[PDB]
Amino acid sequence: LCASYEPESVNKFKFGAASTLKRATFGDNKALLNAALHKKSEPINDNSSCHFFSKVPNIGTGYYKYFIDLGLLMRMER
Amino acid sequence: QHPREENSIVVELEPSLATFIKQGFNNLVKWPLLNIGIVLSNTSTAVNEEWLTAVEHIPTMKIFYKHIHKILTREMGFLVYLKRSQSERDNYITLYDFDYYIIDKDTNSVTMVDKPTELKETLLHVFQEYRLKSSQTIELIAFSSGTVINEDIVSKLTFLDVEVFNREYNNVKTIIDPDFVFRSPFIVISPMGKLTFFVEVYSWFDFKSCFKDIIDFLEGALIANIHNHMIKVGNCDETVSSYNPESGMLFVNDLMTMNIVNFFGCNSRLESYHRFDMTKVDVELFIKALSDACKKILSASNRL
Amino acid sequence: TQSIHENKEITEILPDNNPSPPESPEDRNDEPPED
Amino acid sequence: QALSSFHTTEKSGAVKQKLGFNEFNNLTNLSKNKTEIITLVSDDISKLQS
Amino acid sequence: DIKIISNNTTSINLSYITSGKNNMIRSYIVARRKDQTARSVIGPSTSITVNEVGMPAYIRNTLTEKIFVNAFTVDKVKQLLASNQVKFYFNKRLNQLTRIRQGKFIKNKIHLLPGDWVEVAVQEYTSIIFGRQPSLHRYNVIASSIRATEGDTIKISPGIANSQNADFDGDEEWMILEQNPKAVIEQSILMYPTTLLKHDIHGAPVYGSIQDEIVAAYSLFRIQDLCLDEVLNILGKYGREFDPKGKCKFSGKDIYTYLIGEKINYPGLLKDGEIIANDVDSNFVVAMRHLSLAGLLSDHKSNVEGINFIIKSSYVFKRYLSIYGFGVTFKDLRPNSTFTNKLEAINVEKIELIKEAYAKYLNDVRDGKIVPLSKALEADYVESMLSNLTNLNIREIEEHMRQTLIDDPDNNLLKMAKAGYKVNPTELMYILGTYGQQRIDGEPAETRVLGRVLPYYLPDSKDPEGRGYILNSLTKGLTGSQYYFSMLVARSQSTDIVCETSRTGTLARKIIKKMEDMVVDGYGQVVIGNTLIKYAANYTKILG
Amino acid sequence: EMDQRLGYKFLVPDPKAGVFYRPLHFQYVSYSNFILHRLHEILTVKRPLLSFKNNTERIMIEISNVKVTPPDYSPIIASIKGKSYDALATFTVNIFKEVMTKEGISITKISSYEGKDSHLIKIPLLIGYGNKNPLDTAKYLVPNVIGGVFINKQSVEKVGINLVEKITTWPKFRVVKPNSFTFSFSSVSPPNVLPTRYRHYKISLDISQLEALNISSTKTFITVNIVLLSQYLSRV
Amino acid sequence: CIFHTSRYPDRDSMVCHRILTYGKYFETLAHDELENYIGNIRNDIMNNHKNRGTYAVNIHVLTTPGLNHAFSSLLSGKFKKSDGSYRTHPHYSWMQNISIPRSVGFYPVRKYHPSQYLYFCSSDVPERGPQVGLVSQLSVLSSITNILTSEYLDLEKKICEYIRSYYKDDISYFETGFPITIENALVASLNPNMICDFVTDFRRRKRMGFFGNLEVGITLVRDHMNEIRINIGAGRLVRPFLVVDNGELMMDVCPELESRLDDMTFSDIQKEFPHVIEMVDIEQFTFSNVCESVQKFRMMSKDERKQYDLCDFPAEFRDGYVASSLVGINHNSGPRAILGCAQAKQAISCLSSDIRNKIDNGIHLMYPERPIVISKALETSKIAANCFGQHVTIALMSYKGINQEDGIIIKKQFIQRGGLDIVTAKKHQVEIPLENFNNKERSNAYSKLESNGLVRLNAFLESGDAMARNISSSFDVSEKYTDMYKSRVERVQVELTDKVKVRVLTMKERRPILGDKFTTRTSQKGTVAYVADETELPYDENGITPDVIINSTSIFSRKTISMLIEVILTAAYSAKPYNNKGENRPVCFPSSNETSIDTYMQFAKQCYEHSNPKLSDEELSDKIFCEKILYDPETDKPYASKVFFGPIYYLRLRHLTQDKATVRCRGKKTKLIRQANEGRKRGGGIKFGEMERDCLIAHGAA
Amino acid sequence: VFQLVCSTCGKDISHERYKLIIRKKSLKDVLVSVKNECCRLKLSTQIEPQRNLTVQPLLDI
Ligand SMILES: [Mg+2]
């Protein structure tokens, strides 16, 4: 609550840079219209934003990014 | 005196032998119930289910008391048939209103059995007020638990209308349960080696002969089962009783093993390890004890 | 009962009774103004 | 704690801060323009008596 | 948006999607209904461990599980097709689902290329997610191994009942089955009960014994003269490795030492793997307690040892119950009418003494002899007298408990009291002593019409019994007005419960939404978004 | 123990007073009072509708010949067949102009209607004790039946509870604000005055303004000082 | 009231309210519709005169009074701003026919006001939902007044004549007197010095029938409001009370009453012995001085006695008819009483005499038994003669640690023989266009259909069968049976019109299985957790094994003492169930007991001593306290201590497992969003809520 | 008045039931020959429910 320079209630996203979809899922009912009016461009990191677009949340196993190393496979010959 | 009298027979034996006989009786003596029931006509004030459940538990052993052995070995079956309507006088149903048939189960013969007159003083159902205009009738048939309903037996039911039976049986067959259903003829316990039978004595037939037949059947079955008892002598798989000579440890996990080893000085329960020496077990001594106990049981029953 | 480490005890808060699960739903001027 | 009536109300003659869900909700809301319970502690009692 | 001009909130327009609590996002995007699900009543089973859950037949014959076609499983899939055990087939290269019938389909339609899959009846030891509602914390939803069972109820081990706040008076639970391979691995590791043994914050175990088991534990530690056969009868299938070193008589301490297969010391409880406390009580074998032996075993080695101890100890406790039994009777509570009559006479005398004191003060004030007290002070004095009487009853009950323990050491009710289960001097005071002052909002009931509460008392009555002080006990039986006061308290409690049930959910959801995105970064720091909240996670950078 | 016997005596049936089943008795009467007596009084009206000239030219509407009859089948037949259990009520209506003349009364018919053969009103009927309705005075009681239900159009059985009236019998007090109070009450005509008339009054008092101790209503009475109103009414 | 607010009747008080019965709904609706009818006629005539001439009355406006729609809407459940007046009857119990008509609802107040006591049941209230604290139940001794218009007028005239005749000189004070009102109509002002006499002389005359009505209410308000109020209207609560006249209990100065009470009815007592009982309404009660009991009255001095106006009846008369099913509710905690009242209505009983005739939903008990430890109210209301349970043998012990957290062990042979067996009956209804019914094509769903397109009698329907042929034209579009168990077709009724209407009644017997719910009369509810064989249960020296085993700890942790007493009394009844005349004799153990435990123990001791004259002291004590030594069936050895073991009246509730089971694999979808549909009867799925989503995120399983 | 055995112990109680319901002997005389508690309670508290005649036919069009 005291993360900013002033205390902030739990009913409002005043100082925190919450995402538009985060506000909408919290229950704002008008965040999308204001974002359209102000022309806001946002990334996709929140759990709400990830759930909206069917992405893996950055929680637990999903906190990391995975690749596949094809070097060994391409060094094998039939 | 009364048509029915409650009695007890008490004998004193070794605790383990008494427990063995009690559990053997409760496992091997099965009297079949009349659970294959078909209601052909019902314009009474009671639904089919009430009639069927009431008739399933008719105490039939007092009617078929002359065929105890074969019914116990399941070489013979029985059925009851009822057809009764309202009337001006005696507007109720007793146990004398049924008909009782014995089924040979080899040639599928169906033969009628005699009825005691005392059955005229039993009660099952009381009709409502007699109205000549309306109809109030019940008709049903019931077979014991082991019977198989095929055209061979059905062709013998000359007292029925076959078409009605076929229709109604095809209606009910899907809810009749498939497995065997039975009852214990009387109550048997053995608190601390004190073997007690709680039984019922009726006026019209001799109870001692029936008791003797049941006891003989039980003794034969128990002796055979003892003779066919084997204890694995490999490793313990935690599924059957077994013996490990390497450690000299017996795992008890069945009732007969428990009873015998306790008869020879152990103090085991039904899922437990014990340090027991299998050389102390002498089957012939156990069988002799069982035979003596059966003779004593018959002597006790004779003095009623 | 006995006390060993009472300064670290943890208290239990669990209701004994809970509500059963829900089942399927399945002019005469004759009243006061009520201002 | 709320659903098992863990807390029991009490009567007091002086200002106290309450226990239970309602007080926690009040704290979280952080509503302005209300009275606050100021406490004064000392060892010279005259300053408090005044 | 009709609401711009009007004030009706029933017409359907574009804004209806974000009307209120029934948004589209919070009812279809972060929540939904699923296909592989079930719900049913629950019951207890003694053949299921905390890691397993029993599934009824009617669910096993409907739910289906996925087998992927690859080099390892192709032949098995072909055999399943041959045996008429495949229920569905999915062609991944066409995104086409076919309902493989039983003699009502084609065999050529199947070609089993890699990446396809088939669906068959669900098999035992498959992990399934299940839980109870409301899901207040992490332990209401867990993934366990399937075991076949009888009946039409979902069977659970009583070991997890507290962690879910469940009982068997009509509760229900729900099941879901996700078969994506990543989800399968994560269910097998992260959501396994053996991994959730120790609570996240205070660290105590979340699984343990309940109810009569506790008493059994308390009794087992006290039994003294046992031969080897009786020890093995108690132990059961865990008695293979018991070592009768050189003894011929055993105690319950020997059994507990055998169960704790470790040589560890902990100030108070243990020394060289042996219990040095006086008795075994609820704090030892119940979940969420600070003296649990499973907790010490887990601290010593790992959670596997803790779960093993829980399972084994529960088994032996129930075998003790099977061998010796346990029951409370009426003759344990009230053998005769001596103590109750004594306490009743004491109450009858003391209440009248209090009334006479109050009347003397009132009469003195009514004449010009003393200045009256304030209302608050007078209430305080009366309350003090009544509280003294209540404490007198408490002391009487405690002394009676002590004396009965001396005379009749085998009292089952006092066994429950000692073990630490639901019995204490206050409850016995209610049953046998006095019911005491009834309060609403911390004060007695208020006067309403003629300065009174009920017309059984005169106007402006000062009688304490007439404002909610109950004298009788449950064994004696309350009277009509005492019953009124009792029911007043009860019904007020229930109504408050309903209102709080409404409000707490809203506050909880708000808090959960606010803190949801705070995690530990890769350096053991607590951060949210791009801000640093705390340098060291738990002050230690160790698991909580 | 005599008080216990006297209490028991109130729970048993009392044939002399027409109580055959105490637990629901007060309900049966509550319906027997309406279907037999109050309906006739409510329906049988003779009222002016319009007036002209000066109280010498007015139209009059009269209702009379009210009859109520029960069905012809038992409630079990209604349940099986799927019918409904309703009683049929019919009445005759006259609309006629009247002109006051020195010779007496002048009557000129304008219209008349009857419902002798029609479902003019269908009133749900209460089954009652023994499957017996107040209209039918049969002599057979079905045992173990206590009734208390209705059968609606779709052959569904209905049952209801009692409700508390909105009009109280004591004035309501309310603290509008600090040192400002109100006191509201109601007046209703006796039972034998058809149609019934209602009035709702409020007295307002405020410490700051003691000259405005005022009694008022909504568009039915003046706002006057209550003390002066009492002076006017009682002449004291 | 401005200066002493707490002493003036509050707005939620029952002192200032009245209640509507069945008749008043219809009366008000008739009033409103008649007024609307006349208004419409007037408007039509005015319009016709405005446009045309001759004052013509349009037809089709004086043929539709509009009462039919009003009554239909009333029975549907709409009445002004209330929506609970009427409802469809749920056929759970036979006692509901009493319980629902005697309820009183209040507009949306949830606290227990002191004025509801003694006139409403204290314990019978909803425990959860939106109705919490808004529905109350009358006591067995309460009622609601009725009065006709002619009787109203006659009574009012008599009262006015009495006032004006007997007090000619002292009814014109108007400045320092007590105003006398009849239905809030001021008719006189009495001299203060004569108030008491006026009331006393009045009440006496009321009890003799001098005014022709024995329910007139007279209240004397004296704090400083100084009023005399007389009420005669309808919709008032009234109870009988014992009269105290000049410091004297009339019941004690009427010797002939004790000898004559046997052959007299209540009204005979009122007529022949006035001044013993008075009918008092709630407002008059709230301002009187009432002694709580006869025993407490007899212990007071004459000077103390002189202050009281009435004396109350025993406490068992302050409960409803539902609460009268329970036993000794005043020996337990209150919450248990609330729950017991809630569940006593859900017990299964002999629901209807027309089990085979009525086509309705219901549940029926198959082999009923009449309880024999009861109160008088349960006997007079006939709730006892229609049965709601059976007598079963119970043992209070732990069984292998299985029966925990309210689970119970039940015996297999008890279930086989018919123990607590019920039958559930259900109603099915369909409407079919005539062409589809007569359409001539055998689909696999029409296996149970006869040649006439209707299901066959006595056949069993499955989860995919149809009851009547309905083909849309070469497709089957008929509805389907959708229960996971089968049912037998008991009755079929058909109506032929433009459409075809088919109704079917089906029945199914349901022996107990795992998950089924039972309870006792002290709110000890539990589900079946294990079905034990007769040979796996402990037994006593007579070879009796319990039908039900319940864990004993809950009895003492919840403080349901009365349960124990019940068992003892039941056991005593079994030893000697008849009077000294040989007639069946029930045992009276009322809710709100008031009798001592020692007296019950003495009664039980006498019963056993009559049964077996030769018993040792230890045996007699064991029988009285219901204690026995039980043996382990496996080893035939005793347990450590004696067990509580005996018979009790046991109830079966209506919550069955197979009615709650649900499972989904694949099915339909909602069109707009394309997700699983909803509805257990429609094969819908279970909803994965966002609290479960939070839990899964707490595991770290992304 | 319908079941032919005791539901608790399984004993036969049909003769006593006839002796009670049809011959209308005293409950004492009837119970003279019944010992078990369950059986006495069953013979003392069991009834046949009150029911009307059945409307026929069961299938009506
Ligand atoms: Mg529960």
Ligand SMILES: [Zn+2]
């Ligand atoms: Zn019995």
